[PDB]
Every structure is written in structure tokens, then in C-alpha cells.
């Protein structure tokens with residue numbers, strides 16, 4: 305039996321906190337620039353071959369976003385690969401806040417942004433120390449969360465979201481890129497979260513959902529990964545499935561956590577035990593692929 309490393313939730317939690325400590329990671333801000341440098345630096349320290357994808361992405365309102373997708377690759381020559389995704393930007397508006405006064409205020413995005421990234425940094429650390437059989441790509445996607453605000457009077461186009469993933473899906477970081485499958489982590493740090501099988505994931509990658517939920521159960525996380533269909537959610541994996549044609553699932557809580565797109569999406573609501581359940585399940589999956 306392959307040795308599956310132990311996900312260190314304390315370290316993952318640190319990596320979440322480190323991102324949040326920059327402040328909001330809103331595209332076109334200095335805090336976003338600084339955190340991108342931190343993330344690329346950490347991947348490089350953890351033995352990844354780092355590729356940066358800088359792109360001028362146009363937001364719903366015409367704003368040019370100076371975006372940066374960050375890719376860290378392990379065993380880059382291997383043609384048998386697994387892609388692991390998380391968005392790293394944070395939403396510029398707390399547009400679901402209970403107080404209307406807060407609807408134009410940027411969120412810290414501890415869960416929505418930092419959590420997936422922090423879990424994947426811990427996975428990168430472990431992959432470097434003991435390489436799985438398959439090549440692993442860690443892909444931090446920018447400009448996911450700049451989609452039309454709720455307070456905007458006008459069209460709310462689906463494609464206003466997930467700008468970095470649309471770009472990456474149309475413009476792979478290496479010519480002829482392919483992966484066997486992908487896993488997207490979105491909001492994987494919240495206290496008490498549970499995860500159901502997401503709808504587009506079921507549509508495009510049902511065998512990958514089966515693989516992940518079976519691994520979760522075997523790893524002791526069957527109360528966190530509930531074997532039931534949940535909601536259909538627009539997220540980066542929709543665009544990866546449609547445009548890149550890589551079978552990709554989303555690990556995302558079931559509605560959204562109460563902190564979503566509020567000013568309360570901060571470290572107070574992050575529980576390292578949620579990070580552990582999700583992270584350990586991902587390790588179980590990627591190390592057992594042949």
C-alpha cells in the first residue's frame with residue numbers, strides 16, 4: 305500500500321492566515337500584488353516549477369484587472385497528471401452582508417479565497433517530500449470573485465465570474481497540457497462545514513466525485529463528505545470542464561456558509577479541522593492514483 309502523508313492542519317491554517325494578513329486580495333491593489341508574490345514564492349520554496357500567467361482581464365464593468373494565475377508543477381515531464389485548483393483573489397464587495405452599509409466593503413476572504421489556497425500549499429509541501437506517482441499541478445486562479453455585485457442594476461452575466469479560470473482554460477500554462485482530472489477547493493476552512501456532491505461536478509465528472517467521496521469515507525471523513533447531491537454552483541470548475549475539457553469537481557460547502565460575501569469572512573470562522581478533512585481526503589485521492 306502506498307504511504308499517504310498526513311496533512312498538517314496547523315501548517316495549512318498558518319498559510320490561510322498568512323494570506324489574510326495581507327488584507328483583502330482585491331485585483332489591482334498592492335495587497336493582491338504582495339500576496340501573489342508570497343504564493344509564488346512558497347510554491348517555489350516547496351519544490352514546484354512555477355509558471356506565472358499574467359493577463360489583462362476585463363471585468364463586468366469594463367475594468368481591466370491585472371490578473372496573475374500561479375501554477376506550481378511537480379514531476380513536470382509526466383504526461384499523467386492531476387490538477388488541483390483554488391482561487392486566491394477576494395471579493396471587493398461584502399454584497400451579501402446583513403448591513404447594507406457594508407455592501408461596498410472588501411472582504412478578508414479567509415474562507416472564500418484563502419482556505420483552498422492554504423490547503424493546497426500544505427499539499428504542495430507534502431508532494432515535494434514524497435512524490436505521488438502522477439504529476440501534480442497546483443493552480444491558483446485569479447479574478448474568480450469580481451463578478452457583478454448584487455447591487456448592480458443591469459445584466460448579471462455568468463461569465464463575469466471566474467475570469468482567471470476562463471483564461472487558463474483557453475490558454476494552458478504549457479502547450480498540450482492535459483490532466484486526468486481536477487479538483488477545485490472552494491471555501492474549505494469554515495467551522496462545521498459539510499460537503500455534498502456538487503451539480504456540475506456530477507454532470508461532468510461523476511466518477512471523480514465517486515472517487516473523492518469514497519476516499520473521504522475511508523480516511524474517516526464520511527460525516528464531512530456527505531454522499532448526497534447538493535446544489536449546482538457556478539464556480540471555476542464549470543469553465544475548466546467546458547473550456548479545458550478536464551473532468552473537474554468542486555469541493556464546496558452545503559446554502560453557502562453564513563459568512564459568504566459578508567465582512568465576517570475572517571479567521572474567527574476558520575477551523576483547522578475542516579481544512580484537515582478536505583486536505584487529507586485530497587491526499588488519499590492523489591497518492592492512490594496509478
Ligand SMILES: [Zn+2]
Pocket residue numbers: 395416449565
Ligand atoms: Zn465569493
